[PDB]
Amino acid sequence: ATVYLPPVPVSKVVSTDEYVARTNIYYHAGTSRLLAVGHPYFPIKKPNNNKILVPKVSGLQYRVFRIHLPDPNKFGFPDTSFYNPDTQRLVWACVGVEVGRGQPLGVGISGHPLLNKLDDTENASAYAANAGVDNRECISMDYKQTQLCLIGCKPPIGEHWGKGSPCTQVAVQPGDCPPLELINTVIQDGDMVDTGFGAMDFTTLQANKSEVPLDICTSICKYPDYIKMVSEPYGDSLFFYLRREQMFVRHLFNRAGTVGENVPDDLYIKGSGSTANLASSNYFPTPSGSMVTSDAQIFNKPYWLQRAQGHNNGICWGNQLFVTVVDTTRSTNMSLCAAISTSETTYKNTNFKEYLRHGEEYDLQFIFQLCKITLTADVMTYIHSMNSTILEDWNFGLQPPPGGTLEDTYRFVTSQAIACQKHTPPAPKEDPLKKYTFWEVNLKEKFSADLDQFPLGRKFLLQLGLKAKPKFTLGKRK
Amino acid sequence: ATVYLPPVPVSKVVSTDEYVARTNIYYHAGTSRLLAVGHPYFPIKKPNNNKILVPKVSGLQYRVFRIHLPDPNKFGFPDTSFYNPDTQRLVWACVGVEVGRGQPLGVGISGHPLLNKLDDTENASAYAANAGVDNRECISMDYKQTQLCLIGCKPPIGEHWGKGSPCTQVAVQPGDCPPLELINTVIQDGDMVDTGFGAMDFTTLQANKSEVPLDICTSICKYPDYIKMVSEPYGDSLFFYLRREQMFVRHLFNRAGTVGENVPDDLYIKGSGSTANLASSNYFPTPSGSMVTSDAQIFNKPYWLQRAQGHNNGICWGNQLFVTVVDTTRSTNMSLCAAISTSETTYKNTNFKEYLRHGEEYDLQFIFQLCKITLTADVMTYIHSMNSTILEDWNFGLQPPPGGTLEDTYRFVTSQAIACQKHTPPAPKEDPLKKYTFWEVNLKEKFSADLDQFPLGRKFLLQLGLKAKPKFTLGKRK
């Protein structure tokens, strides 16, 4: 005819849901309530090995979850007269996410036994000046409140400051502290969130390497970059996000070490004592939360999707979801000990072996609407400019008489114990949306037609208004 | 395209029997008999040199001929064209072949002066007769009866177990058999059939290199890989095969050499005497050829190809036919002698020097049908997806150049240089064969249009139209 085919144009820019037709077939899925039990400070490892016994897990750390979904076409159902692959394909839409939380109220504990600290800024108890005696006290604090969630379907980018271009002398010095330049990179699980010492590295950035707690000392601090993802024009990176966050200053303190900083002698009169001695500008705010209650949560509340913020409506492109959740409002650490031999009721370390843990619970409950994509060449070719991969998976054509399979393929192991060998099996693979480890959530075996067995789907029913479904009734309670 | 490469196919692969029309125009061809006189055991080379004086020829190896055919569109025609040469193109179909044997009934023979054989273990005589220095014997066999012929147009696939190489994950040393991996390769001329040790290489499995005859040590031994071929729908690699093979167990024997195996020493009770020790548990059945009969000849009777395994029925996508023949049943070895001197007037075995040859005949008679493939735009797209080279060879749009200009080396002549001279003169040239290893039969003008005076022909007229004979055929009763 036709022949060819413009895309149809990329510079005609449209909803990513002007060609995705929803249907009223709904399924439910969720988890069992996943648990990770770490140590807040670091991992407590075997000291003969690098293998962990106790990981490092807190709520002050990124919980990045990789939700996996089948292609719906490939998933069976007992009734299926809504898809024909000679005409259409299928793709999931998630239309509701409930974040179950079930932990006590409590907050993560962070500290350094050799935290740099000299005097009180809040008082004038002692001087901040030159000091060749460097004080290091055992101080601990809880970090700031961070609650957020983002639900997306592609990997999400947080920003931090790295060490950019260098200085011409050594770094972290008067007048030769280097240029710190912004490296946006994908959020990592179990790397640190923002902590109230800002979002940056500390290993190479901080060359003292001892002024800040252990959990962020060896680790990067990063904050999710919202601006960038909402300035992407398909909004697949994320398409829903929310936050509730605040810091409280525990107290400003001043670090020990001498003064390198310049004090102009044209801004103060000369005398004796104080008016002839230099002053430290080595203050650090101490991060802490302002108040924490379980009614100050943003969690435990259903999120009803029906047209995402992004140009998505909440479509699982690739049939995956990337959920990155932070919760600190609950992030309790529990202390335990084991007596090996009581022989005095008064503490001894040949008795009571103190232990610290943090236990972390999360549940994710879901209702997924099925939607369809028609196989139209104009849509297909436009999808191809956006990303060819969904198309290639569906598979179209030759295969001249047929290559790859069949052929007839393949030979023939099927391992025994000889087996056939040599082997060295073929390689390890990385997923194309995986760059960094996530807390994997497989969902490929839990789909229910009925939604009355789960409180998240009922609540969806009542909110939906089919058929027509109470809603509420009173009382409650009273 | 678009849509899309095509569709559909794949799945369901369009037969070349829905738009490829047969015509009633027949040509006839055949060969003038083929004769090759070798030495089956080894080629006899001049050992002062490296070149053959008697080749290796045998019916106990594949005789695989690469037949190259004209194309009908090269002809000036006798007027077989009534339509435009771009609405259709012409291709041959071969509709009957007879493969004749000119060799008498009687088998060929192979052997080895030092076949690795210890003692007889069918019914004892020993446990071992040796486990030190030497023990091999003068022993000959005719390998198993195999008759088969198979016809394709692309190269056949063979299977054999190649050397999987000793592994060091599971304990296998030299002096233990390797794990064995099936390494499949094209059936090519000079290659040996299956011997009933399995079908495997012997060039690097054998390390004495003298367990078996001179002939199979220096070949790859193969079994036909029917399995992958009959799973190509088109069947371009073969669209015809048949087999008849059989073998009987002559006598159980034990190989020369000591166990390398690990025997659990707890599956018997120890004796006293001869019964205390163990023989070598390297027993092998000794195979041997079958009785030859004229009711086993699959040859000198016509194989029709009016219908074929594939969609292919001899349809030229290269203008080549591959015909593989095995005949072990008329592969007579004829014995003869010449006297070294007439200085010896008595009977001596240092006088009359026995010599063996094998003479090998093949004749192939062919009847060729003229066929056409009707081309529409849609058809042309299917072929383009299929194998683009076919369109170009036929000659079909759309080709760039132009092209131009200048050139260099201008005037004069040379003349010194000046001028230019670069110089620099072109074309190595290099290099792919695409021979690969076949007995070349050129057919290009052995084509005819009468088929009343070829024997195959007469029978084909009888079968097709029920006429003409020409007067009469057979009996009656008789």
From TrEMBL, chains A, B:
<keyword id="KW-1145">T=7 icosahedral capsid protein</keyword>
<keyword id="KW-1048">Host nucleus</keyword>
<comment type="function">
    <text>Forms an icosahedral capsid with a T=7 symmetry and a 50 nm diameter. The capsid is composed of 72 pentamers linked to each other by disulfide bonds and associated with L2 proteins. Binds to heparan sulfate proteoglycans on cell surface of basal layer keratinocytes to provide initial virion attachment. This binding mediates a conformational change in the virus capsid that facilitates efficient infection. The virion enters the host cell via endocytosis. During virus trafficking, L1 protein dissociates from the viral DNA and the genomic DNA is released to the host nucleus.</text>
</comment>
<keyword id="KW-0946">Virion</keyword>
<keyword id="KW-1164">Virus endocytosis by host</keyword>
<keyword id="KW-1161">Viral attachment to host cell</keyword>
<dbReference type="GO" id="GO:0005198">
    <property type="term" value="F:structural molecule activity"/>
</dbReference>
<dbReference type="GO" id="GO:0019062">
    <property type="term" value="P:virion attachment to host cell"/>
</dbReference>
<dbReference type="Pfam" id="PF00500">
    <property type="entry name" value="Late_protein_L1"/>
</dbReference>
<keyword id="KW-1160">Virus entry into host cell</keyword>
<dbReference type="GO" id="GO:0039620">
    <property type="term" value="C:T=7 icosahedral viral capsid"/>
</dbReference>
<comment type="subunit">
    <text>Self-assembles into homopentamers. The capsid has an icosahedral symmetry and consists of 72 capsomers, with each capsomer being a pentamer of L1. Interacts with the minor capsid protein L2; this interaction is necessary for viral genome encapsidation. Interacts with protein E2; this interaction enhances E2-dependent replication and transcription activation.</text>
</comment>
<keyword id="KW-1015">Disulfide bond</keyword>
<protein>
    <recommendedName>
        <fullName>Major capsid protein L1</fullName>
    </recommendedName>
</protein>
<dbReference type="InterPro" id="IPR011222">
    <property type="entry name" value="dsDNA_vir_gr_I_capsid"/>
</dbReference>
<keyword id="KW-0167">Capsid protein</keyword>
<keyword id="KW-0426">Late protein</keyword>
<keyword id="KW-0945">Host-virus interaction</keyword>
<dbReference type="GO" id="GO:0042025">
    <property type="term" value="C:host cell nucleus"/>
</dbReference>
<dbReference type="GO" id="GO:0075509">
    <property type="term" value="P:endocytosis involved in viral entry into host cell"/>
</dbReference>
<comment type="similarity">
    <text>Belongs to the papillomaviridae L1 protein family.</text>
</comment>
<keyword id="KW-1162">Viral penetration into host cytoplasm</keyword>
<dbReference type="InterPro" id="IPR002210">
    <property type="entry name" value="Capsid_L1_Papillomavir"/>
</dbReference>
<dbReference type="InterPro" id="IPR036973">
    <property type="entry name" value="Capsid_L1_sf_Papillomavir"/>
</dbReference>
